Design a protein around this nucleic acid. Sequence first.
RNA 1: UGCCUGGCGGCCGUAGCGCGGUGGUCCCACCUGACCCCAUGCCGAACUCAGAAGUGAAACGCCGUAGCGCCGAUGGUAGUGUGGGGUCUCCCCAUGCGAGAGUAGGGAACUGCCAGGCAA
RNA 2: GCUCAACGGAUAAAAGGUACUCCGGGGAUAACAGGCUGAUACCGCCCAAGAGUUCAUAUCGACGGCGGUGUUUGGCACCUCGAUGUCGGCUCAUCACAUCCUGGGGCUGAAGUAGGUCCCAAGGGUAUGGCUGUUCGCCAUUUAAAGUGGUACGCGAGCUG
RNA 3: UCCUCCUAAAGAGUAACGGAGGAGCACGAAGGUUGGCUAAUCCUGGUCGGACAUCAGGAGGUUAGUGCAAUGGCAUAAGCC
RNA 4: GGUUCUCCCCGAAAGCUAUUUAGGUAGCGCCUCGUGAAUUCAUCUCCGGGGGUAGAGCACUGUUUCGGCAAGGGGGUCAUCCCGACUUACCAACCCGAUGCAAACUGCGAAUACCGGAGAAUGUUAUCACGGGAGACACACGGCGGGUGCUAACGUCCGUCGUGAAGAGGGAAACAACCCAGACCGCCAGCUAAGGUCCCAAAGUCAUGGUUAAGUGGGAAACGAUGUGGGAAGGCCCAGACAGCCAGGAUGUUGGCUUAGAAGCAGCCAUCAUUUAAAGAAAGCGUAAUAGCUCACUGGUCGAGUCGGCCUGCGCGGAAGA
Lengths: 72, 75, 136, 94
Amino acid sequence: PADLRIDTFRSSGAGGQHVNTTDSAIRITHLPTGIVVECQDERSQHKNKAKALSVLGARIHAAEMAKRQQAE
Amino acid sequence: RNGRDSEAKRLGVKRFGGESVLAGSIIVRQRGTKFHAGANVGCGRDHTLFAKADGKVKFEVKGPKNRKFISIEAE
Amino acid sequence: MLQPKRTKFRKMHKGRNRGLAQGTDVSFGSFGLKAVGRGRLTARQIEAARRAMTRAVKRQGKIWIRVFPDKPITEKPLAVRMGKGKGNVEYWVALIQPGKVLYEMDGVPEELAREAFKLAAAKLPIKTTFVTKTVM
Amino acid sequence: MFTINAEVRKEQGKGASRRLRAANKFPAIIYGGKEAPLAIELDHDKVMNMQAKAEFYSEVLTIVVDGKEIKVKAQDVQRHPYKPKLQHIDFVRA
RNA sequence: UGCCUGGCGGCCGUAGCGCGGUGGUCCCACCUGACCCCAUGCCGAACUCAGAAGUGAAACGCCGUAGCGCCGAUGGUAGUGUGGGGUCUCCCCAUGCGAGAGUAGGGAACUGCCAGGCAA
RNA sequence: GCUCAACGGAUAAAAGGUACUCCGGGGAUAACAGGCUGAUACCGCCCAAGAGUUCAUAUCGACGGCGGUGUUUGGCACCUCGAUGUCGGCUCAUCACAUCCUGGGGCUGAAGUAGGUCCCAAGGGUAUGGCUGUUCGCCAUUUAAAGUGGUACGCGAGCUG
RNA sequence: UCCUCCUAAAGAGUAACGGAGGAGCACGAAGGUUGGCUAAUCCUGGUCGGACAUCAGGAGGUUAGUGCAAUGGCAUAAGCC
RNA sequence: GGUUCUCCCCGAAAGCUAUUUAGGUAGCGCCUCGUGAAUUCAUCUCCGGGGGUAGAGCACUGUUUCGGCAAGGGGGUCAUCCCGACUUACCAACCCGAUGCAAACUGCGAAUACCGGAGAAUGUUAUCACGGGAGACACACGGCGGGUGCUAACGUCCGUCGUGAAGAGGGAAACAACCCAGACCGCCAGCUAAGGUCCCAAAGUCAUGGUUAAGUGGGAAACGAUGUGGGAAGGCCCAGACAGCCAGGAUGUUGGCUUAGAAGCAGCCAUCAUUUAAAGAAAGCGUAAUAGCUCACUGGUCGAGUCGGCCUGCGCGGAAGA
C-alpha cells in the first residue's frame, strides 16, 4: 500500500437521501499493472473496501500465475 | 454471549464485635466456614453461626491452625 | 513478537497505570536503559527495538529483555457501533511505570553501548535514558 | 578521605522527610544493634559525588555527628527511581 | 522442694523440620504367646486378650548444633482521609494515619493441674 | 395436573403486508446538514536497516515512533420531526495555501536543453468534447497549466428534475 | 428465570448487547448413627507388564477427593470403607 | 396543548424492586401535615470489632526473562540383528539461584467507610413509629474510584460527594453544570471571600531580590541546538593547555579476498614490528586500483584559562485553513 491510487465517490444507484451523500464506492488502481476494480455493494465503505481488496488480490495473483503458465 | 449473573445473597457478618445479641440471632451468614463455632453458638446447615444463648459477642483466633472462632461471653 | 503462550483468560480490563516501578537496578548486564516517562510498550515495539540494538553491536554482546507484555489490549472493528460486546484481541502491551529497566547488555565497550541505546530509544514511545551498573 | 559531616534529624515523618530532600538534604539512619538507632540527615551533593568510587560501599566510613567520630559502613541504599539522586542510606554501625 | 516419667490443657511455628549425642531401677515403646471375650472386605500387622525371659535399635522424651523454616524492629518508601495547586491519561504542597518487601538482630520455647520413680 | 422458559404467570385459544395508507406524539429516536472527537482518511515530522555501481539522508525509505488539519467513511445523538428540500449540471461566486502554471532562491545521481526535490510566494490565470443521471474516471485533442480544498460536500423565496 | 466468580472502590448492596462458567436433576444409599481408615504425583525393586493395571518399600504432603459449574470450606475430616 | 387573584411556612426525586413494562402505573426510599414516644438521632474523643481493596509480594493458580544442573528429544559416527555400543555447532521439563506481571492469584495488608458500646458540648427533636395529602421513577456536569470505548467524545453505564435542576449575587470577556457565596424588606454607611489594582473599569505605573528578548507570557509533542541564568563535580593546565600558524603523518605492505581488484578504503582479517620531536597497517574524498589532499597523534610559535558531560530555572525551532 504505497503505490495504490485509491479513489472514492458517491455510489451510483438506488437508495434515498443517504445514497446521494455517501462516498460508499471504492476504486483501486494498481500503478505497476494498471488494473481497475470498481465496487459498490454494501453501505459501509470499509465493508465495500473489504470486497475491493479481495477481488484485487485474486487479480494480480492470478494474472501472474497465468503469465508464468503461458510462458511455461 | 455472556451477561448471565445471579442475584447476590447477602453474606458476611451481621453482628460485629461488642454487640449484645439475644438468643437465636444470626451472627454470620458464612458461605464456607471461615468462622468456626466456639462457645454458646451452633453451626447450622448453611454454616450460619447463630447465638445458642444470649450475651456479648467476642471473636478469637485460637486453635492449632489459626481459625477464627466466635464465642459469646455470657452476661 | 513476545506473546504469552497459552494465557489464562482471553481478554482483561483496561486498568489504570500508577505508582513507580520495581525492576529498577541493572541486575544482569553492566549497562541498562531505564524508562523515565510513563506509558505502554506494545509487543512489536520491543521486537523492533531488539533488532536495532543487535545491529548496533553487529555480532557480540548479550541482550536481556527485562519486560514482557502479557496484557491484552483489544480493539473494536472499524465502523462498528458501540456495545455489542468487547472487541477482539489485537496487540499485547506492557505497562511501563517510571523507572523501569527495559533492556540491558553486557560484553561490549561502554561507548559503543551508548551508541546502541540511542537507536533503540528513538524506536520507543516513552522518553528513556541510560544507566550503568550500580555496585550497591 | 571518607569523612561525612552530618546532623541529627529532629522532625521525622513523610512530610518532614520530603521537605528536606527538596533542599538538597537526604535522610539516613545508623543502627548497630548495641545502641539507640540514630536518625541522621546528610548533605546530598557531597555524598552523591562520593558514592561513585568503589571504596564507598566496602570501607569503614567516618560519619561526623556532633563531634563524635563514629565508624560505620554503608549497608543498604534506596535510590530515586529515575533521577540520579539518593533518598535514603542504611549505615550499619560497625 | 530438686531432677526425670506418664496423663490432661493453656498458648499456637521464637514453640516446627534436619544433623550429632544420650536415657531404661521406675515409667514408656518394641517385644513373648494367643484356643477363648473380640478382630482381619486376606493376614493378631492394626484393633483386643493373657503375659513379660529380652532390648533401648526403631519409636518416644531430654541435651547440643543455626544449616533451613519462623519471628522481627528503628529509619525510609508505596498508598491514602480532609483541605489547596499544577505541565491536572498524573503528580505536588499543608496536615493526620502509615504499611508490604528488605536490613540489623531475635531465636532451637514457655507454662498450668494431678499421679509415680529417684533423692532431700 | 402448566418449557404458563416473554419464567410476578394479560386469554383455555392467535402469524404477516402496507410504496393506497390514516390519526395521535417525539428531535425522548434515525437518514441529509451543523457540533464534540479523529479510530479510519489526508498531510508533515523523528530514528535509520537498506536500496541508489562506490555512498544511509540527489532521490526513495523497511521494522518502529510523535504530531497537525477537520476535506472521506464512521463513532456519539447535543440543535431541528406544529418541516432545516437532498445528487449532478446551469448560472454566479468567495476565501484559505498543503502551489498546477507564471515569479525568486537552495541542492542534485544539475554539461547543455528538459527534469527530480525542498524553501518563499495566493497578484492574476487555471480547457473543449465522446460516454453515463453522473460526481468520479477512462479516452480523443489541446494548453503556460487543465491545482487540491472550505463555503448547509456554496448556491431550488434563481433555474433544471 | 435461577447458581458461582469478577467488574464492586476491604460491611451489605450496585449497571451495561461488560469479562468467564453452570442448572430445569440425581440418591432407599450418595440419607442417620456408631466404629474404623486415609490422599495426588513421582522414584527404586518385582511374572507375562508396556509411558500408563495390581504388589512391596520410599520421597511427598493434600498439588487429591468432594454425584455435576465456580468460589468459600473440609482431617475433629464435610474425603474413603 | 392550556388551566385565570395575593401573601406567609416547609420542600422533594429522576433511585431500587416488578410490570406485553421501558415517555405509563403500584409498593418502599426521599416531601409535607397531624398525633404520640425514649439524651432516640447527628458530629468528635476513647474503646470493642470483622473485613481483603489501594499498595506490596510470588509458597499456591497462571504467566515470564537469564544463568547452573539436566532425563528425554534432533542430526550423525556404528553391531547399518540388537541389547544400546561412541560423539554432538543443538532443543529441553522437573529442580536450585536471580528479575518481572495479574479483574476472575494471596503465605501479607493499610487509609477511609461501616456496626456496636461508653463519655462531654451543641443542634427551633435533627430520630423512630402510626395516620391524612402528594410529586417523582427521562436526570445534567464537575471532582475522586471504575467497566466500556482508541487511558477518543459536552459519549455511554454504576458507586460516592458537590453544584444545576429548584438559586439569583461577584469572579473566569460572554458562559445552568467550575471558583467564591445562600437574596425577608428598605439605607447615596462600614470590613472582607474568590479574583484583581497602567487604561476601557473600582483599586499599587507600590516596596525588595532575581529570571526571560520570544510579544514568551497570550494554544501542543517526539526530537534538535555553543539561546541564557543558577548549582555540584571532573579532565588538562604559566614543567605553558585549548584554538590558529609552520613540519612529519611514513618503512616492511598491490599485507593472505575466491593470487584478475577494492594499495590506511564495501560483505575480506588481525588490531604487528621499527624510527621517535611523532604518526592509526586508520575518518573521508577520488580512482578498476593507484596517484592526490586532510585529520588524528607529535615538535617550535604566541601565551592564558579552556574543554566535555551531569543536575535544574526560563526561553527558541518543531507550528499549515478556509
